[PDB]
Design a protein around this ligand. Structure first.
Ligand SMILES: *[C@@H]1O[C@H](CO[C@@H]2O[C@@H](C)[C@@H](O)[C@@H](O)[C@@H]2O)[C@@H](O[C@@H]2O[C@H](CO)[C@@H](O[C@@H]3O[C@H](CO[C@H]4O[C@H](CO)[C@@H](O)[C@H](O)[C@@H]4O)[C@@H](O)[C@H](O[C@H]4O[C@H](CO)[C@@H](O)[C@H](O)[C@@H]4O)[C@@H]3O)[C@H](O)[C@H]2NC(C)=O)[C@H](O[C@@H]2O[C@@H](C)[C@@H](O)[C@@H](O)[C@@H]2O)[C@H]1NC(C)=O
Ligand SMILES: CCCCCCCC/C=C\CCCCCCCC(=O)O[C@H](COC(=O)CCCCCCCCCCCCCCC)COP(=O)(O)O
Ligand SMILES: CCCCCCCCCCCCCCCCCCCCCCCCOC(=O)CCCCCCCCCCCCCCCCC
Ligand SMILES: *[C@@H]1O[C@H](CO)[C@@H](O)[C@H](O[C@@H]2O[C@@H](C)[C@@H](O)[C@@H](O)[C@@H]2O)[C@H]1NC(C)=O
Ligand SMILES: *[C@@H]1O[C@H](CO)[C@@H](O)[C@H](O)[C@H]1NC(C)=O
Ligand SMILES: [Cl-]
Ligand SMILES: [Cl-]
Ligand SMILES: [Cl-]
Ligand SMILES: [Cl-]
Ligand code: NA
Lengths: 97, 280
């Protein structure tokens, strides 16, 4: 009856170390609507994160876009962390160029 | 014309228990949000300077009061009839209503409802149609909602008379954003191996607007039928992201290219060339 969120992490531009860019996290296919989404920089919550208002697709599953400006580096690690009623603990999906 | 052809309002009503329920809402031009809605104050948020279309402030304030009275009143009625409808808490109700401009110029209206993520009802010819997934509960809801000629009349006016004029006015008022052209950028990468002796080649296409785009893996002028399109994903600032992948045997990847056709390019297709032995 409940559907767990699908998480897709991608950059707006091709990743180039030291070049400014956008980090997107598309959270979709979930039900019910209540959800918690954070973007992480080396495991720590980014506070300057923008998001779309709740929407849903034709099967009535909900989706959201969360995004932030970032500059990818050799070592900095980025991720999207999601908590939903269907998950025991937050699910973390790492950014991979 | 290019860009969105439809306007729709959405509702997500969450009934946590017998004493608590909240409704989330917004207004959209296909996938582009133009209205926000504050859940507890019951007030609209205008996201673009042209979000009111050609409607006057008066008419917009009138519609806002209609949605506010509807939203608060909907939670009240659901809570009263919850018992009779054998509702177990928590439950979630969704709705979508709007209209669309077709080729030939006809505007078609729609209103759909869901319960628990499943289809519940739809509106056809100003009438409540119960959905099979809704069962006896949807049959009962439609029997009850027609008992109130007021709600019915209002839904009719909003769907078949307000929405078409609103849609034409807002597609005109917003045409500097809705019909702009933004060029994509494209790049190549190698994905995980799909199987023995195979590679996965990825063609990334991002930042384009409007949404229609053509991306194919090629061998010269020959389109590779193995090209798998991913889901068209959103970016910030009303643009899109797409991945077109191809499964190939190693040794057969040389000679491949990715070609992009988009309205904004004006016939000058983007062509990327896969090169061998890590020359990318
Ligand atoms: C916001 O925009 C809407 C769309 O406006 C048009 O498109 C935009 C993008 C701009 O380019 C505008 O300059 C342009 O007007 C407005 O709605 C439209 O308004 C016009 C009136 O201005 C209206 O035209 C009338 O149509 C009736 C017949 O309509 C029936 O039949 C058609 C099919 O034929 C059907 O599609 C309809 O649904 C109806 O069933 C006709 O009798 C009228 O004729 C009379 O007036 C004309 C001069 O206007 C005169 O030459 C004739 O001799 C005769 O007296 C007239 O042509 C459109 O039908 C209507 N479009 C829609 C979808 O509704 C909208 O205007 C407001 O609402 C209208 C319904 C009307 O009450 C107006 O007076 C309102 O201002 C506008 N504003 C708002 C706030 O919505
Ligand atoms: C600037 C913005 C432009 C927007 C342009 C228009 C877009 C509109 C599209 C269609 C939207 C239709 C859905 C809204 C329905 C509102 C109904 C209604 O009467 O709500 C209000 C009052 O409602 C209540 O108090 C009753 C509570 C809700 C009862 C349950 C309703 C179930 C949902 C409708 C299902 C309809 C099925 C059959 C219809 C033919 C306000 O009315 P009024 O002002 O006359 O006092
Ligand atoms: C300007 C700003 C634009 C943004 C506005 C955002 C909000 C817009 C909201 C409108 C969305 C309309 C979508 C249609 C809703 C469809 O709802 C359903 O299908 C409901 C599902 C039914 C669940 C059954 C639960 C049992 C309770 C039955 C209550 C019936 C009460 C009737 C009483 C009559 C009242 C007098
Ligand atoms: C669409 O709605 C209107 C309500 O105003 C109905 O008149 C239509 O009903 C159909 O036509 C009438 C004249 C009568 O023959 C009736 O039996 C028909 O159902 C209605 N259309 C449909 C198909 O329901
Ligand atoms: C009803 O739901 C709210 C959360 O939505 C909760 O905090 C509250 O405790 C619940 N019931 C009571 C006893 O108020
Ligand atoms: Cl996932
Ligand atoms: Cl055109
Ligand atoms: Cl229609
Ligand atoms: Cl390579
Ligand atoms: Na959880």
């Amino acid at each position: 009856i409940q559907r767990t969120p699908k998480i897709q992490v991608y950059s707006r531009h091709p990743a180039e170390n030291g070049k400014s860019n956008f980090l997107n996290c598309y959270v979709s296919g979930f039900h019910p609507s209540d959800i918690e989404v954070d973007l992480l920089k080396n495991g720590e919550r980014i506070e300057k994160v923008e998001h779309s208002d709740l929407s849903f697709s034709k099967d009535w599953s909900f989706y959201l876009l969360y995004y932030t400006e970032f500059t990818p580096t050799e070592k900095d690690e980025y991720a999207c962390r999601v908590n939903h009623v269907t998950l025991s603990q937050p699910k973390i999906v790492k950014w991979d160029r | 014309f290019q860009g969105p052809t439809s306007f729709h309002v959405i509702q997500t009503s969450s009934f946590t228990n017998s004493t608590w329920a909240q409704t989330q809402g917004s207004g959209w031009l296909d996938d582009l949000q133009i209205h926000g809605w504050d859940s507890d104050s019951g007030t609209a948020i205008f996201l673009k300077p042209w979000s009111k279309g050609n409607f006057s402030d008066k008419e917009v304030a009138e519609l806002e009061e209609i949605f506010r009275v509807y939203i608060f009143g909907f939670a009240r009625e659901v809570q009263d009839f919850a018992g009779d409808f054998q509702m177990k808490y928590p439950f979630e109700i969704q709705g979508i209503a709007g209209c669309e401009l077709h080729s030939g110029g006809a505007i078609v209206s729609f209103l759909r409802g869901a319960l628990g993520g499943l289809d519940f009802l739809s509106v056809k010819n100003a009438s409540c149609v119960p959905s099979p997934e809704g069962g006896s509960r949807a049959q009962k809801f439609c029997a009850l909602i027609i008992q109130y000629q007021g709600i019915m009349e209002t839904v009719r006016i909003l769907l078949y008379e307000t929405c078409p004029r609103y849609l034409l006015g807002v597609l005109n008022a917003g045409k500097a954003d809705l019909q702009r052209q933004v060029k994509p950028e494209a790049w190549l990468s190698s994905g995980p191996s799909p199987g023995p002796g195979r590679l996965q080649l990825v063609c990334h296409v991002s930042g384009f607007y409007p949404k229609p785009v053509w991306v194919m893996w090629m061998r010269g002028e020959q389109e590779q039928q193995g090209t798998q399109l991913g889901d068209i994903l959103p970016n910030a600032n009303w643009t899109w992201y797409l991945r077109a992948t191809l499964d190939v045997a190693d040794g057969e990847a040389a000679g491949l290219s990715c070609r992009v056709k988009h309205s904004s390019l004006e016939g000058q297709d983007i062509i990327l060339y896969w090169r061998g032995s890590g020359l990318n």
